[PDB]
Coordinates of C-alpha atoms in Angstrom, one line a residue:
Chain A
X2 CA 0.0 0.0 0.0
X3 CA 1.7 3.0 -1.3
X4 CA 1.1 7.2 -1.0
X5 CA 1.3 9.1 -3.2
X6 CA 2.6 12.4 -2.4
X7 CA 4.2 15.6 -4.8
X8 CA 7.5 15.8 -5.0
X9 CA 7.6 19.7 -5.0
X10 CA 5.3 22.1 -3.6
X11 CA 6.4 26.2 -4.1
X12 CA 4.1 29.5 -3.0
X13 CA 4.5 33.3 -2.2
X14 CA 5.1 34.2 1.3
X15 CA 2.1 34.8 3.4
X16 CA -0.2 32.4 0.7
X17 CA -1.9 29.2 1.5
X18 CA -0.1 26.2 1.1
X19 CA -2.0 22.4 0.4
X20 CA 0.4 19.3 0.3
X21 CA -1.7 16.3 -1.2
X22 CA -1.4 12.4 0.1
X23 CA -3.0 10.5 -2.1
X24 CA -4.4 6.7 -1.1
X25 CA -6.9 4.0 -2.0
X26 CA -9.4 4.5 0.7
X27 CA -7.8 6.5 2.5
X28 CA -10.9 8.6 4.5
X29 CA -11.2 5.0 5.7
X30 CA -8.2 6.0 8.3
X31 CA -5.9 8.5 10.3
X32 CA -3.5 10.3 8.6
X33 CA -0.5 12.1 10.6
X34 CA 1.7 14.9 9.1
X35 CA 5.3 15.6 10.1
X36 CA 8.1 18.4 9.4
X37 CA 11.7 17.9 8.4
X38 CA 14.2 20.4 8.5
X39 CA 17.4 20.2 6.2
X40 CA 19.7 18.3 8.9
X41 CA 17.5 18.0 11.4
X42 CA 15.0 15.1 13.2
X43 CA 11.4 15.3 12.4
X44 CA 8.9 16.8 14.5
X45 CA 4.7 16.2 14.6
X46 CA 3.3 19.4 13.1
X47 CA -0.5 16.9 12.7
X48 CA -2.2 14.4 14.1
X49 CA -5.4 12.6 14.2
X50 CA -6.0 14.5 10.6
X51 CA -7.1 18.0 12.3
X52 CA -5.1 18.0 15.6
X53 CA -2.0 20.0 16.4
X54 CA 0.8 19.3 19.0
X55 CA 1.6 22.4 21.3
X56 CA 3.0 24.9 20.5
X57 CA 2.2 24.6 16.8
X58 CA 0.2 27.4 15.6
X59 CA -3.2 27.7 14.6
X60 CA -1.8 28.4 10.5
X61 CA -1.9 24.2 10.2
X62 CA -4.8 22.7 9.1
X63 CA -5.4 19.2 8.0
X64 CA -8.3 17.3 6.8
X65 CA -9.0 13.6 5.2
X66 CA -11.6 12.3 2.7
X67 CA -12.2 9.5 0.7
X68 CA -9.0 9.4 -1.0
X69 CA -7.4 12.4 -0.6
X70 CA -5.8 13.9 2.6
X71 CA -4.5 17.1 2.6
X72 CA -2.3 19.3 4.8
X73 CA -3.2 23.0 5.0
X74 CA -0.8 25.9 5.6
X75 CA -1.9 29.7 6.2
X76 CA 0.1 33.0 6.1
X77 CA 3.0 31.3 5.3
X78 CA 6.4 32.2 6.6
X79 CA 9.8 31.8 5.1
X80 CA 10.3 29.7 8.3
X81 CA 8.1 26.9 7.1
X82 CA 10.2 26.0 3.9
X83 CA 10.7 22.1 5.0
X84 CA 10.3 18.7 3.8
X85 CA 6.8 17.3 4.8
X86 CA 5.6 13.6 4.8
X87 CA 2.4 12.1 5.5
X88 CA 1.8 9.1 7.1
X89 CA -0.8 6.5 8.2
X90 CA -0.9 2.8 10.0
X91 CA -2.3 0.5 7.4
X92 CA -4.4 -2.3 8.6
X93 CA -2.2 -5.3 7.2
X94 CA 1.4 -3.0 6.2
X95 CA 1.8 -1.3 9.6
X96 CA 3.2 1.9 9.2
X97 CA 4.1 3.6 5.7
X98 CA 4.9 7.3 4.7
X99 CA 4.3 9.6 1.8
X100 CA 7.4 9.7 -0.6
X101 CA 7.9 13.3 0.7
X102 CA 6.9 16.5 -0.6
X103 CA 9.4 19.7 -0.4
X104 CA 7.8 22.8 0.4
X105 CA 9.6 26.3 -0.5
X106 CA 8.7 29.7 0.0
X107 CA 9.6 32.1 -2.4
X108 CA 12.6 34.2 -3.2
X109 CA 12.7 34.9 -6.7
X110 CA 10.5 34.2 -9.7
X111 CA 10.3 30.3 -10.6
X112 CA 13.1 29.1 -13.3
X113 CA 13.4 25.9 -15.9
X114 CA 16.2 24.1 -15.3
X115 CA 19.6 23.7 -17.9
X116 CA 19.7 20.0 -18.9
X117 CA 22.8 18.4 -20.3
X118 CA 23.3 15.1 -21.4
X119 CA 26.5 13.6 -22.4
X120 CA 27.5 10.0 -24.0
X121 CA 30.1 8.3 -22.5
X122 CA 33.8 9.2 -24.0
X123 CA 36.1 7.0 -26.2
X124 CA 39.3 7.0 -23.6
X125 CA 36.2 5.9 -21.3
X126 CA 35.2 2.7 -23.5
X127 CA 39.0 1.6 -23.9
X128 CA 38.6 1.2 -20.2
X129 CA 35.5 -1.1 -20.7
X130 CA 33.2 1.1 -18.9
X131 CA 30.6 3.7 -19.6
X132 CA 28.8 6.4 -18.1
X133 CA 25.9 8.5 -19.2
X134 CA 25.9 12.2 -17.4
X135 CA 22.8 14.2 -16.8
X136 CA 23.7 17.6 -15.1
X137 CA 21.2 20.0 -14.3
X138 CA 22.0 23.6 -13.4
X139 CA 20.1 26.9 -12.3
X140 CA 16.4 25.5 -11.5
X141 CA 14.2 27.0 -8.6
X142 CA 12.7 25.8 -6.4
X143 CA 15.0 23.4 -5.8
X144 CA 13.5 19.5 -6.1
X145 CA 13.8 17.9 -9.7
X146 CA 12.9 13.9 -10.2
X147 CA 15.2 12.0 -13.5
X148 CA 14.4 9.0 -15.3
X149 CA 16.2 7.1 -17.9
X150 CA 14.7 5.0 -20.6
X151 CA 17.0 2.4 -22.2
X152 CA 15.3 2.8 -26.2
X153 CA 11.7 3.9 -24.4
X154 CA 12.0 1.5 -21.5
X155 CA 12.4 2.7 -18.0
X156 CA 15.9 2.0 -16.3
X157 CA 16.5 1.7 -12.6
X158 CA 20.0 -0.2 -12.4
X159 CA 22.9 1.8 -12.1
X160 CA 21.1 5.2 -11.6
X161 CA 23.1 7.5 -9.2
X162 CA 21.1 10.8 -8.8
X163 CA 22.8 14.1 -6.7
X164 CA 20.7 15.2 -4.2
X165 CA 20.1 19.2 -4.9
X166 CA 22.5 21.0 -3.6
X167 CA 22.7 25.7 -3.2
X168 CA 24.4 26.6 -6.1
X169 CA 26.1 30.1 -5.3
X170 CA 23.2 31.7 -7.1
X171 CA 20.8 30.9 -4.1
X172 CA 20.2 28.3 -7.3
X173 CA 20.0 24.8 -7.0
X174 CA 22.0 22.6 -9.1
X175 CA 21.9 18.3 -9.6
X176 CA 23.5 15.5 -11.7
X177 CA 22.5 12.3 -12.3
X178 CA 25.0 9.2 -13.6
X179 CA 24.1 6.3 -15.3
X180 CA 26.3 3.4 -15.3
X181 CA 26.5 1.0 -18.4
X182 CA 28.9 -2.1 -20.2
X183 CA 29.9 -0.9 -23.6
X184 CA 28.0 -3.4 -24.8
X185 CA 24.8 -2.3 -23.3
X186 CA 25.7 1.2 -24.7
X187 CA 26.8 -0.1 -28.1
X188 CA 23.4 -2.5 -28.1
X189 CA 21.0 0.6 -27.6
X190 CA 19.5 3.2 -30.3
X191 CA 19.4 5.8 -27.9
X192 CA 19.3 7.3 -24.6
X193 CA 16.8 9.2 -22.9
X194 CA 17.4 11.3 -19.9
X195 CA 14.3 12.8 -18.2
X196 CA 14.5 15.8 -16.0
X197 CA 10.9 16.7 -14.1
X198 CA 11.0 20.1 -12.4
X199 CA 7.4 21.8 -11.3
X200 CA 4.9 19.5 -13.5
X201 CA 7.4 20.1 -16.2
X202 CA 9.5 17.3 -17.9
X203 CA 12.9 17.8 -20.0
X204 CA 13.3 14.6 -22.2
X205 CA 17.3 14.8 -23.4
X206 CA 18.3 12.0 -25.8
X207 CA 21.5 10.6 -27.3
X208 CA 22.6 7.7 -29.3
X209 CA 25.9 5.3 -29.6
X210 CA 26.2 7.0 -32.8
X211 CA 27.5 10.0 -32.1
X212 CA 29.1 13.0 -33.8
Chain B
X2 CA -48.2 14.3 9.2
X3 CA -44.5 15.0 8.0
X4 CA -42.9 13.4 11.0
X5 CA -39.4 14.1 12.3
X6 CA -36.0 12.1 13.3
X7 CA -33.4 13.5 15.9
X8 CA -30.0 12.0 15.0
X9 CA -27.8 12.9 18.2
X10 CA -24.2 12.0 18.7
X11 CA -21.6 12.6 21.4
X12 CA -18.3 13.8 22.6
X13 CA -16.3 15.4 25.0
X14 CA -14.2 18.3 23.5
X15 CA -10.4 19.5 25.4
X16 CA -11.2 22.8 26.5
X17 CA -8.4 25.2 24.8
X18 CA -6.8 27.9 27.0
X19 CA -8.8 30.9 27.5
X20 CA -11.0 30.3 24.6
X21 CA -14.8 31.5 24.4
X22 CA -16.9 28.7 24.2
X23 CA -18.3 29.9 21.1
X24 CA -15.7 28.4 19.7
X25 CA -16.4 24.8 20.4
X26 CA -18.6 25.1 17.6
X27 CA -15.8 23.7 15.6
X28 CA -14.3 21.6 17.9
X29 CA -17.9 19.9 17.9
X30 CA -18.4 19.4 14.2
X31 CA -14.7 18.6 13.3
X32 CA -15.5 15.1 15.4
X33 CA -18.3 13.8 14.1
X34 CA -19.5 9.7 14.1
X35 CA -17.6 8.7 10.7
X36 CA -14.6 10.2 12.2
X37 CA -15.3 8.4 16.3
X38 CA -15.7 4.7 14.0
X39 CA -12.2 5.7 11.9
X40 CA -10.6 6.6 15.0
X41 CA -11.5 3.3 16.9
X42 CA -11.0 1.5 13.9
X43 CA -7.4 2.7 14.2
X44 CA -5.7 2.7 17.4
X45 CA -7.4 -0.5 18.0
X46 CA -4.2 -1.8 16.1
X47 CA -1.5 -0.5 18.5
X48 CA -3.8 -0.4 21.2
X49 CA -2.4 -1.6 24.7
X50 CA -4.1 -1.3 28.1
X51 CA -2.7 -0.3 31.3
X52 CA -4.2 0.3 34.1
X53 CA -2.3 3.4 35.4
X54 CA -5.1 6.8 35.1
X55 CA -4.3 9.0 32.1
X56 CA -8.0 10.8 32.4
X57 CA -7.5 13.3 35.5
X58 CA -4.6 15.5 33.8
X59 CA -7.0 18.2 32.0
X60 CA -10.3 19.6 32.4
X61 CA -13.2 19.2 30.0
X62 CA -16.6 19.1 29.1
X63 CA -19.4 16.3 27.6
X64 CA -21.6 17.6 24.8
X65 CA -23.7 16.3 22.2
X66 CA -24.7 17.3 18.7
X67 CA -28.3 16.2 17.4
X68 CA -29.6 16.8 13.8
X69 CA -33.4 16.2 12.3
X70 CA -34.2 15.1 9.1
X71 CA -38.3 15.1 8.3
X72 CA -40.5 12.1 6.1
X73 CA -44.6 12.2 5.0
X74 CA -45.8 8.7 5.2
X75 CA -49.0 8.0 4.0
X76 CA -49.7 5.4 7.2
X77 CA -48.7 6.1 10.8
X78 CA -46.5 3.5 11.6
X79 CA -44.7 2.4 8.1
X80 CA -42.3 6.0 8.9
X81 CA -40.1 4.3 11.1
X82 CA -39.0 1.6 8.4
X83 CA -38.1 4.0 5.9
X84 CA -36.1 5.7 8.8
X85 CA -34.1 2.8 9.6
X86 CA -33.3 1.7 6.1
X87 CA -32.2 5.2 5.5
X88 CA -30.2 5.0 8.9
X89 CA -28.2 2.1 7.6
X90 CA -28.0 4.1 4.3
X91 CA -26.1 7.5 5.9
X92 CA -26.3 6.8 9.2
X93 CA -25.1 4.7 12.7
X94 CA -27.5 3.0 14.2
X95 CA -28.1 4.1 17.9
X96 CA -31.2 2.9 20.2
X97 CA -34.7 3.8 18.8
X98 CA -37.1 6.1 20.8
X99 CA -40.4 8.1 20.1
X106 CA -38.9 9.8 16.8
X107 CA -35.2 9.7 18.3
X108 CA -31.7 7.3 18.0
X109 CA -28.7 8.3 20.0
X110 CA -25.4 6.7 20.3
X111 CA -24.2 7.5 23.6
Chain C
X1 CA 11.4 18.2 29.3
X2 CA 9.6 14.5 27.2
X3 CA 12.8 14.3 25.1
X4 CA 14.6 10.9 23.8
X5 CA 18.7 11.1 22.9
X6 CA 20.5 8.6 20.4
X7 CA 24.2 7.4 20.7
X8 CA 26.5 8.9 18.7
X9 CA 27.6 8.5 15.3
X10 CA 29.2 5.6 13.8
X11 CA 31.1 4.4 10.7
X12 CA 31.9 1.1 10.1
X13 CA 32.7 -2.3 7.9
X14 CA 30.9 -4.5 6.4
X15 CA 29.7 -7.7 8.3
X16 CA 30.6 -6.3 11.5
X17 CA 27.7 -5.9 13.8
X18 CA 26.6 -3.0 15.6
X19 CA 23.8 -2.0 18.6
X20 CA 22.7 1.4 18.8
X21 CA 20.6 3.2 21.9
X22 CA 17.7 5.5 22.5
X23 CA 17.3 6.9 26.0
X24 CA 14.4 8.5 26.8
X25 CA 13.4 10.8 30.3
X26 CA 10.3 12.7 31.1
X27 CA 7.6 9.9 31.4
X28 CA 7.0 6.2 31.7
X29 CA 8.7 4.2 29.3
X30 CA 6.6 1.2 29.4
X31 CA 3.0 3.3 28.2
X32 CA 4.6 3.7 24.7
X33 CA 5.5 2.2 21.7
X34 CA 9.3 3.3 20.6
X35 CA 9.7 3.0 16.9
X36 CA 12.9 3.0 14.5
X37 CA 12.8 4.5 10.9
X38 CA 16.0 4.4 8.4
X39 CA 16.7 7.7 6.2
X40 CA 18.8 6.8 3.5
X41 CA 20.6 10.5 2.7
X42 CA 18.4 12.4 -0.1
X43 CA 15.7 9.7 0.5
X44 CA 12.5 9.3 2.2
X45 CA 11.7 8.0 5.5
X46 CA 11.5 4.0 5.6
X47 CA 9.7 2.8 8.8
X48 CA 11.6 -0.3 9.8
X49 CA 10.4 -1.4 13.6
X50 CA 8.6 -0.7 16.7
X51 CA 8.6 -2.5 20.1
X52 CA 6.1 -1.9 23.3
X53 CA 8.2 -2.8 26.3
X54 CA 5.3 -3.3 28.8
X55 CA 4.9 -6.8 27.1
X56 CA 8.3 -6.4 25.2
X57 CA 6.7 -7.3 22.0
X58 CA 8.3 -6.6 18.4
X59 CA 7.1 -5.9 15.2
X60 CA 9.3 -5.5 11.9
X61 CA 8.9 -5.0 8.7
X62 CA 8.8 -7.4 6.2
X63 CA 12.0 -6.6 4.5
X64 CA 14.1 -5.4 7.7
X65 CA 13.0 -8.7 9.2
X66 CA 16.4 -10.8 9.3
X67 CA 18.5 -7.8 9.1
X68 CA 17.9 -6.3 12.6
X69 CA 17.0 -7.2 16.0
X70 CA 15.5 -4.8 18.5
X71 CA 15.9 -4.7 22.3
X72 CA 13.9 -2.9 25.5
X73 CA 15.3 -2.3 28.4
X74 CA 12.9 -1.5 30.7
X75 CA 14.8 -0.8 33.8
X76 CA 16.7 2.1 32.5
X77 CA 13.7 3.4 30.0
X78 CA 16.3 2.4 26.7
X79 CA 15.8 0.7 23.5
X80 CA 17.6 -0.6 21.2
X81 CA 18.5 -1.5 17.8
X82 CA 21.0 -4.4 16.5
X83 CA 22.7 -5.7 13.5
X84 CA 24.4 -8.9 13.3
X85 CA 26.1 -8.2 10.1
X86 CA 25.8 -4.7 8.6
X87 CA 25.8 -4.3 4.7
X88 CA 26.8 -0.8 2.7
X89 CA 22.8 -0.2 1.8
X90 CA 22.3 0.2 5.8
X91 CA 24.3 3.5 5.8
X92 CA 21.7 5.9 6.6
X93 CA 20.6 8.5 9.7
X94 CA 18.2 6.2 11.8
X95 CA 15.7 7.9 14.1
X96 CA 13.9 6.6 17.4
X97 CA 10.6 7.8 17.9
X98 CA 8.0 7.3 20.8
X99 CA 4.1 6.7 19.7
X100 CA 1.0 7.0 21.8
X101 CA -1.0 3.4 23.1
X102 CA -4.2 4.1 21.6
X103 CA -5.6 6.4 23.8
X104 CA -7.8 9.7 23.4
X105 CA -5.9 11.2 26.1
X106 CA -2.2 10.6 24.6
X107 CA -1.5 11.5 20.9
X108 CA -1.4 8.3 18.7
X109 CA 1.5 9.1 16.0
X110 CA 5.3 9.7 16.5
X111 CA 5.3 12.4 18.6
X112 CA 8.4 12.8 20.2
X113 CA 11.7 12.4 18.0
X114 CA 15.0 11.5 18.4
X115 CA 18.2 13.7 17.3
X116 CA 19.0 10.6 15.1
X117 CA 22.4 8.8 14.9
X118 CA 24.1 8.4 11.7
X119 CA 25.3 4.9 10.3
X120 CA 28.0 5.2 7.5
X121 CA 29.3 1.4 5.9
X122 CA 31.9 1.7 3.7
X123 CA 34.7 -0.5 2.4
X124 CA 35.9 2.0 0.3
X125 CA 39.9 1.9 0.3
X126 CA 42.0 5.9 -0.7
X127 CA 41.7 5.6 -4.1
X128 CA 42.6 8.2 -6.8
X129 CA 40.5 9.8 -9.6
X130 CA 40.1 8.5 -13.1
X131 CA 39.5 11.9 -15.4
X132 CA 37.5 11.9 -18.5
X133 CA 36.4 14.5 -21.4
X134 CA 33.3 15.1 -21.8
X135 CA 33.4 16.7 -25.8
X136 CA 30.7 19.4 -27.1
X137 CA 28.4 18.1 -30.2
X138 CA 25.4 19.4 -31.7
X139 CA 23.5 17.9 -28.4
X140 CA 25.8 20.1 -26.4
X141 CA 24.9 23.6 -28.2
X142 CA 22.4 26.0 -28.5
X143 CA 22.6 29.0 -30.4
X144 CA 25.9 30.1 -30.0
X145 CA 26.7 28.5 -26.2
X146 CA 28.6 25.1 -26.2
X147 CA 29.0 23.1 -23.6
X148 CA 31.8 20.4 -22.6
X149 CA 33.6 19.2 -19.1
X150 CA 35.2 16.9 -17.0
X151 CA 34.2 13.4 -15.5
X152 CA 36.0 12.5 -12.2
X153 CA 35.3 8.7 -11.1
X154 CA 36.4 6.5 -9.2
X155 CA 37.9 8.5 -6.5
X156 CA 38.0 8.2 -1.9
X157 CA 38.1 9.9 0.0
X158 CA 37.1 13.3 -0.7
X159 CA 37.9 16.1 -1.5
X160 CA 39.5 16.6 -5.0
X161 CA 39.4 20.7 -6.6
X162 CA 39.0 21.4 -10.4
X163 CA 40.1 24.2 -11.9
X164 CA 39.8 25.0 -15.7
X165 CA 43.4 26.6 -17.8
X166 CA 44.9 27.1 -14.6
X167 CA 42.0 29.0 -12.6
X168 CA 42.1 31.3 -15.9
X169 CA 38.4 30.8 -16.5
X170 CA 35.8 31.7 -13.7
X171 CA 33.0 32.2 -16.4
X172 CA 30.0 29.7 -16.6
X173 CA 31.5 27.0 -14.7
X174 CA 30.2 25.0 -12.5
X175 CA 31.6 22.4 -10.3
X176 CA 29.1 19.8 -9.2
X177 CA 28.7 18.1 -5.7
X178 CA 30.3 14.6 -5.7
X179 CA 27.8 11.5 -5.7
X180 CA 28.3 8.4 -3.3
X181 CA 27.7 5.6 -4.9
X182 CA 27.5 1.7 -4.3
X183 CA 30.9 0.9 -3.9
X184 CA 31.8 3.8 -1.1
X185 CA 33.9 5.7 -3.8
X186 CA 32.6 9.3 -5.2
X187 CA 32.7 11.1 -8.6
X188 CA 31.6 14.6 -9.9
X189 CA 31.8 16.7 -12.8
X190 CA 32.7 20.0 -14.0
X191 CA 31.3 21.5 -16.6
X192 CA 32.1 25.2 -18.6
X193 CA 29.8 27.0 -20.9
X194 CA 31.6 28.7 -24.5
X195 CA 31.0 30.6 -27.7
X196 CA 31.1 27.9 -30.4
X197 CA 33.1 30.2 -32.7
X198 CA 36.4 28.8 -30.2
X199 CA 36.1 25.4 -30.0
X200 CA 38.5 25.2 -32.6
X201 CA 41.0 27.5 -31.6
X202 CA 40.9 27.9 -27.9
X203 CA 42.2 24.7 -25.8
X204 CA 40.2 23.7 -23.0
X205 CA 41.8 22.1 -20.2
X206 CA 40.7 20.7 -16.8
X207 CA 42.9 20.6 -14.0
X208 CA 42.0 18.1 -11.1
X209 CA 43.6 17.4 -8.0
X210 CA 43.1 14.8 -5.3
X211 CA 45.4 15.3 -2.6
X212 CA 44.9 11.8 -1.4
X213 CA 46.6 10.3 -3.6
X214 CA 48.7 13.1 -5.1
X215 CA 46.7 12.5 -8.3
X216 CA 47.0 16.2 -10.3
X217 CA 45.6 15.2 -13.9
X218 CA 45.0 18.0 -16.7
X219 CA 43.2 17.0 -19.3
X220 CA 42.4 18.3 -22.8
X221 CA 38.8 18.8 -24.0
X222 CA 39.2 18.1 -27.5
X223 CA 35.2 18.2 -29.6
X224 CA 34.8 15.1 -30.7
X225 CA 36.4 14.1 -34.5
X226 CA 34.2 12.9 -36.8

């Protein structure tokens, strides 16, 4: 039994935030919502779907329905930029959390992110190795997912992904490595390398024949 | 003769700090019966009992909250099965009274 | 104050085993349920166990089953969390969190939180970096901009710098953070925007240094030859 939750959530200071957690059934239960910080231990910002912990201000709502729970946030502060999860206790799986949705308040106007792919090099495939490098630059806010599709088909092995780091900009920046045989690269028509920023995908191909 | 139901519920709401009761408006309809059988349907999975009191650290109050829904019935007495089959439709079923079902 | 503290950090081999703590002081241990979740670094949180010491019973999940083992020390209000050989995919920042009984007057989630203690597995032996070009093509360019850069792999432990022509060029590069991947060892890569008019004239050249293994490697970024 999985959630589903957004990976990025962005508004203005002093707007209403929603963070979504999305199950089958799942008005049929209690849903709990916790607060990361960057580097630090979570802490209970909801419970019980509606109720708060003290000292948590009355700006947190939550509510639940049939398959849709959703945590509510009003007059937002800069101080509430944060990584939020949702979570449940299933009747057969126990306990299970939202995949995590990053929430960022606004400092400057929303930007695409710069996608390059590169093919692995020739000194690199006298060595009997190959790498496929994805590098994404200057994107805000800062949380980006990345596929790859071996000739259309999804890929999973050998992935290594960066997690999002402040570029001096007060920009993020991200890579993403993909590990391969020659053989596997030379057996392929292309390469696709899939960049998701904001409900927006970049789809960056290449191909063993290159030049 | 459009006769009438009275659908009553209840709870016991924490009484927040310095608050005008006037508020408890929401703290009464935020917890209503779908959200009681959710709830017990959920800690009864982790549930463990001891025996040590956890009741006398706050004080609150007991409430309840009732609504009425109305039906014309053409007979006297053929109301009250429409009523329950419309209970186990949108509704928990409490104990029956004359017309009156509470769960409490 | 209702607060729980973790051991301290710890970095390790694999197939050595390791018990970590959680200590916990402002209320009765045995009315609550202490659970452990892993945090893989850049990951979600992945509940693993939970234990009630009043009847010390256990429950895992289904994967962490064989891997760990945990403990509940009633007598000094502690639990604990055990592996009898540890792997590299166990290095992650593991939390201890205490959770309600399943009743209206306590709160039934993870209320209380643990600083968290961080579990770093690695074999990884100092290693130096092997550098690769990475050559501008048509893929690389748009309208007038060209990109190209550097590969480092292969590499422990960090740091390692890059510098492009000697620290000449300080315009549209940027040098990416360094992945850890399977094997303990890191890479990065460093990458510079261009004109396209110089690719054919101007040399490109990528200076890397990793101390470690006084590795200093300058390489040429030649654009591919077709």
């Amino acid at each position: 039994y999985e959630l589903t939750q957004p990976p990025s959530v962005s508004v203005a200071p002093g707007t209403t935030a929603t963070i979504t957690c999305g199950g089958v059934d799942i008005g049929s239960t209690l849903v709990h919502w916790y607060q990361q910080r960057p580097g630090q231990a979570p802490l209970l910002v909801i419970y019980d779907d509606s109720d708060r912990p003290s000292g948590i201000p009355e700006r947190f709502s939550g509510s639940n329905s049939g398959n849709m729970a959703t945590l509510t946030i009003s007059r937002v502060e800069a101080g509430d930029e944060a990584d939020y999860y949702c979570q449940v206790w299933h009747s057969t799986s126990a306990v299970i959390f939202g995949g995590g949705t990053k929430l960022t308040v606004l400092s400057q106007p929303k930007a695409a992110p710069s996608v390059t792919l590169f093919p692995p090099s020739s000194e690199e495939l006298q060595a009997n190795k190959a790498t496929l490098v994805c590098l994404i630059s200057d994107f805000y806010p800062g949380a980006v997912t990345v596929a790859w599709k071996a000739d259309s088909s999804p890929v999973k092995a050998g992935v290594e992904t960066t997690t999002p780091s402040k570029q001096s900009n007060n920009k993020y920046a991200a890579s993403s490595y993909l590990s391969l045989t020659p053989e596997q690269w030379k057996s392929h028509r292309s390469y696709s390398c899939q960049v998701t920023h904001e409900g927006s995908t970049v789809e960056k191909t290449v191909a063993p024949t290159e030049c | 003769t459009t006769f009438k139901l009275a659908a009553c519920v209840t709870l016991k709401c924490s009484t927040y700090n310095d608050s005008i009761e006037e508020e408890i408006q929401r703290c009464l309809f935020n917890t209503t019966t779908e959200i009681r059988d959710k709830k017990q349907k959920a800690y009864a999975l982790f549930y463990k009992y001891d025996i040590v009191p956890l009741k006398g650290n706050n004080s609150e109050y007991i409430l309840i909250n009732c609504q009425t829904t109305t039906t014309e019935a053409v007979d006297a007495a053929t109301a009250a099965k429409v009523f329950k089959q419309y209970a186990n439709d949108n509704g928990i079923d409490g104990e029956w009274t004359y017309f009156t079902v509470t769960e409490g | 104050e209702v607060q729980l503290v973790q051991s301290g950090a710890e970095v390790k081999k694999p197939g050595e085993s390791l018990k970590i703590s959680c200590k916990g002081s402002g209320y009765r241990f045995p009315s609550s349920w202490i659970g452990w979740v892993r945090q893989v670094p850049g990951k979600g949180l992945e509940w693993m166990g939970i234990i009630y010491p009043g009847d010390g019973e256990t429950r895992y999940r289904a994967s962490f089953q064989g891997q760990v083992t945990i403990s509940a020390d009633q007598s000094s209000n502690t639990a604990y969390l055990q592996w009898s050989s540890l792997k590299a995919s166990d290095t992650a920042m593991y939390y201890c969190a205490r959770h309600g009984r399943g009743v209206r007057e306590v709160i039934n989630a993870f209320d209380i939180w643990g600083q968290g203690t961080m579990v770093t597995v690695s074999s990884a032996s100092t290693k130096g970096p092997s550098v690769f070009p990475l050559a501008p093509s048509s893929k690389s360019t748009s309208g007038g901009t060209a990109a190209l850069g550097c590969l480092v792999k292969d590499y422990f432990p960090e740091p390692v710098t890059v510098s492009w022509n000697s620290g000449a060029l300080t315009s549209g590069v940027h040098t990416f953070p360094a992945v850890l991947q399977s094997s303990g060892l890191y890479s990065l890569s460093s990458v510079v925007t261009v004109p396209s008019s110089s690719l054919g004239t101007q040399t490109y050249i990528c200076n890397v240094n990793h101390k470690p293994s006084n590795t200093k490697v300058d390489k040429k970024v030649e654009p591919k030859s077709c």
